[PDB]
Design a protein around this ligand. Structure first.
Ligand SMILES: CC(=O)SCCNC(=O)CCNC(=O)[C@H](O)C(C)(C)COP(=O)(O)OP(=O)(O)OC[C@H]1O[C@@H](n2cnc3c(N)ncnc32)[C@H](O)[C@@H]1OP(=O)(O)O
Ligand SMILES: [Zn+2]
Lengths: 263, 316, 316
């Protein structure tokens, strides 16, 4: 029941960290949070209703790099307890209907595959039919390499869905957690009306290692971090996780023109 | 500079060149020289036919990266007329990795956007080896919006290693540029025809490749990551690239059966580099055919069909 | 730090401060100290009333540049609640010279954009003295488009020396940013209310000031070029600035009689810096009245009225 924060090397009490939404109480380090726990924290209590739960990985390419991709999917599903990376849940936020989606970075690096894109499109469609904001928490290593173009196209698909939402005037907030790279930051994570990002979150398109290889120099200090990006204009604002829920509610209360939430 | 497996063919071609020079150096022995030239030409044709009969996915990927191949400017020159090149994204700078403009396809006015790798070693470094910074995708978006304004169909040539993973290009929001292109290109009210001539992929190619008709040349590849990268991350080695290329399924016939592209444009025998004119003619015919059956649809029906085609991607 | 012509008033105020300290240092002489404080307070009020009775155009221009005056953030704090600041133009960087966000005006959700000069000498250099680079006008456009999307009225605070004439800002297309803002702000489907609190002009202020209702504080200026520049180019000297300020007609009533602004917001006696709370209250009342009479119009009628108002500028 005693965990340690790797950034500061403290001895955080486990339940103390858990009740603080997996944030170090000492150095305020934003550590891993599972999709289901994140969506339970955001949305109101007793109103969660999962969407797109009938979709499961159905590998067709029969990929095999060093382990059978079916074996990879089985192992990840057993480890994390989720069918695929993205989890969509309808619910209420301070008395306001809202559809939320959260990545599960433990599932093959939160990579975006066919099921991820299909679930995201289901979330967008649900938001459209029942007019309400969409909130997406992004934590992904990129596009699922074990599905090739069938994964790459999921970018375009999801983008199109968001375009539809933008045409209807429905707000869409895109929280950028740590990390958000590859085809998730280039398709729908940075395609939100407001690009909120958690502190010190590695956000970009190409990972630091490949940038180092190509440039063969020293990257600027604090490269691709949230604090470095907000000065580059890619991030609208940086919100701490314990204050996220309320902040989001307030924002969507003003974008939708609804009365302010009761604190 | 032919590929490794094309060493025999190259040798034969060199021989032919030599014989041609001899035929242009004397006159009393023209008959025998010409007969030998014809015989060796038939030999080269048959050798190229048999060599290319069975090419692996790695061989195809090498062909798509052949350092002698028509790029966007070459196809524009050999299949389009009256091409005016528009430069600048109006914000920061004009990326030479993406060339765009407005030209005429058999008299019809069309907008052309595409990646340009560059021919020699000077242009290759001038054009960043076909890898565009975000200020190239922003120019592509600007030109696509301009074309969509003046009821103009759009034609895209996708030939690039990917988006440039530089520090400067990363500071200026590459992800935002790509995402904005992907979002906006699905709402254009004009038919879009995309071809994957050469090498494309990694998502820096889908930024100008969300179209109504997606076409690919026979010996061209389109992958979520280069075989080198897939091998490095997954195979834990760089010399196992061909295994990654075979496993991903990046070849045109393999992608066709997955319902990811619309048609494959057959290439001249021995790759598109041997006979660029025939390749340009085939591509022009395919473009005209694709525009012919896209004009019938109304703008609303065109957009609805595009949306449905996008939503039909993937097995889920 | 009061202005030169306000030297007498400042002295009296200083005197009052001293007396106040004395009134807070002893208790047996409170009656006489309080009576003297009241008498000197009345003296200061009458002196400020008579000094400000006749102010020249140069004096007003100095007031608009007073190094103690509520900026955009001050008005936001004292007249708006629940203000979330949105930063970044999504392309290059976020300009600190322009602050924008979304807040609530008496419960109504509004979008706020405005120049921010900065209070002290550190923030002044951090915010480029209120002079925005093109990546600030692009952020302003992004926020205005966002507000127009979600049926949200827009409120603009125009307080800036002008657009930054830097080499970097010039390389990144300042002219394009300003022109795009001017073109797009005339088509917004939401009512726009603009005020010229403080100093504005040179065209880097009109970039966020093409609105349905244009308001100006009593002691604020709005000129095509700063009086120093007008004197330098035309009067061939810099010490003849007050002549240029008087000749141009940069004071609020002078622009009012030309049908260039809608109304003048009366300021607290002695300039808006003496009583910022009263200034904020007056501005909030004016904003509420302008939105009250702008909501009745339909979106199409609103846009038509805006277009007609724009086309009615000038004597031709
Ligand atoms: C081209 C594309 O879109 S995919 C290319 C890969 N991704 C990138 O280049 C962008 C970022 N690159 C990265 O390496 C990471 O995402 C970083 C920089 C954020 C580092 O995050 P890390 O903490 O190092 O995570 P890591 O990469 O180990 O991801 C965890 C797991 O997800 C896997 N993974 C992550 N992304 C992918 C992907 N796109 N395809 C397949 N597997 C992936 C990794 O192989 C790893 O598996 P393993 O631990 O069993 O070996
Ligand atoms: Zn810690």
């Amino acid at each position: 029941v005693w965990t340690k924060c790797d950034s500061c090397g403290q001895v955080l009490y486990r339940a103390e960290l858990e009740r603080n939404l997996e944030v170090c109480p000492k150095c305020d380090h934003h550590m891993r949070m599972t999709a289901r726990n994140r969506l339970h924290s955001l949305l109101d209590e007793g109103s969660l209703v999962e969407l797109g739960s009938e979709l499961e990985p159905k590998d067709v390419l029969k990929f095999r790099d060093s382990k059978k991709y079916k074996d990879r999917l089985a192992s990840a599903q057993k480890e994390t307890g989720e069918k695929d990376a993205l989890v969509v849940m309808k619910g209420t936020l301070y008395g306001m209907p809202v559809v939320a989606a959260a990545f599960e970075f433990a599932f093959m690096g939160g990579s975006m595959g066919s099921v991820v894109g299909a679930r995201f499109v289901r979330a967008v469609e649900q938001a459209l039919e029942d007019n309400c904001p969409l909130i997406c928490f992004s934590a992904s290593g990129g596009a699922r390499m074990q599905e090739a173009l069938m994964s790459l196209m999921q970018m375009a698909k999801t983008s199109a869905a968001l375009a539809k939402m933008q045409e209807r005037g429905l707000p869409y907030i895109s929280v950028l957690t740590d990390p958000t790279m590859g085809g998730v930051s280039a398709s729908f994570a940075m395609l939100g009306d407001l690009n909120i990002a958690e502190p010190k979150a590695l956000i970009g398109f190409a990972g630091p290692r490949v940038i180092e290889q190509t440039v063969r120099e020293k990257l600027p200090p604090g490269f691709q971090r949230s604090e470095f990006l907000i000065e580059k204009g890619a991030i609208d604002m940086i919100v701490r996780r314990p204050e996220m829920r309320l902040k989001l509610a307030s924002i969507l209360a003003k974008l939708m023109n609804l009365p302010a939430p009761n604190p | 500079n032919f590929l490794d497996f094309e060493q025999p063919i190259a040798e034969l071609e060199a021989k032919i060149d030599s014989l041609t020079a001899v035929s242009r150096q004397d006159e009393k022995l023209d008959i025998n020289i010409d007969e030998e030239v014809h015989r060796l030409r038939e030999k080269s044709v048959e050798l190229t036919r048999k060599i290319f009969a069975d090419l692996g996915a790695w061989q195809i990927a090498q062909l798509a990266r052949h350092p002698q191949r028509p790029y966007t400017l070459d196809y524009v020159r050999l299949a389009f007329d009256e091409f005016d090149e528009l430069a600048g994204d109006r914000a920061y700078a004009d990326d030479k990795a993406i060339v765009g403009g407005i030209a005429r396809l058999d008299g019809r006015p069309v907008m052309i956007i595409g990646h340009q790798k560059g021919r020699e070693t000077k242009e290759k470094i001038r054009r960043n080896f076909g890898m565009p910074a975000p200020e190239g995708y922003r120019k592509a978006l600007r030109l696509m919006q301009m074309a969509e304004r003046f009821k103009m169909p759009i034609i895209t040539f996708i030939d690039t290693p990917g988006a440039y993973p530089g520090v400067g290009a990363e500071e200026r929001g590459q992800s935002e540029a790509i995402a904005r292109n992907l979002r906006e290109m699905s709402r254009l009210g004009v038919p879009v025809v995309c071809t994957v001539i050469g090498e494309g992929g990694s998502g820096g190619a889908l930024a100008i490749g969300v179209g109504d008709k997606v076409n690919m040349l026979q010996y061209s590849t389109y992958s979520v990551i280069s075989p080198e990268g897939c091998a490095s991350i997954l195979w834990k080695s760089a010399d196992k690239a061909p295994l990654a290329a075979e496993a991903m399924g990046i070849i045109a016939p393999r992608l066709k059966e997955l319902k990811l592209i619309d048609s494959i444009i057959p290439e001249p025998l021995g790759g598109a580099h041997r006979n660029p004119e025939a390749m340009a003619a085939s591509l022009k015919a395919q473009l005209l055919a694709d525009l012919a059956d896209l004009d019938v649809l109304s703008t609303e029906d065109l957009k609805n069909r595009r949306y449905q085609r996008l939503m039909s991607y993937g097995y889920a």
